Amino acid sequence: NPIPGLDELGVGNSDAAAPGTRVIDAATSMPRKVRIVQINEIFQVETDQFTQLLDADIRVGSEVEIVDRDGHITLSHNGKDVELLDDLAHTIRIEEL
């Protein structure tokens, strides 16, 4: 790309570019601290053992955090951790606490 680039972008800030990060994009090498803000699911049919997470009386993992595990992804809540699945981990909209 020899030509230069445009510059009509406004508001950049650092990270946080949209209300939603899925309980997986927030998980980093270290167990930071995030939270889910929407566990909606317009999937024509997607549940599996995950139904347990929804039946755990929690939803949107409330305020907690995750810990990517090389392909796997676990969730850590204030006094409670769970092991979801990277498959559905990319559905609910979550963010940082």
SS3 36: strand
Q: How many domains is the chain built from? A: 1
Method: NMR
Task: Report the side by side order of strands in the sheet with 63-69.
Answer: 80-82, 72-77, 63-69, 34-38, 93-96
What burial class does residue 91 get, using C-beta atoms within 10 Å of its C-beta: 0-12 exposed, 13-18 middle, 19+ buried? buried
Q: What is the CATH number of the domain that holds 47?
A: 2.30.30.90
The residue segments making up the domain with residue 1 are 1-97
Residue 70 is which amino acid?
D
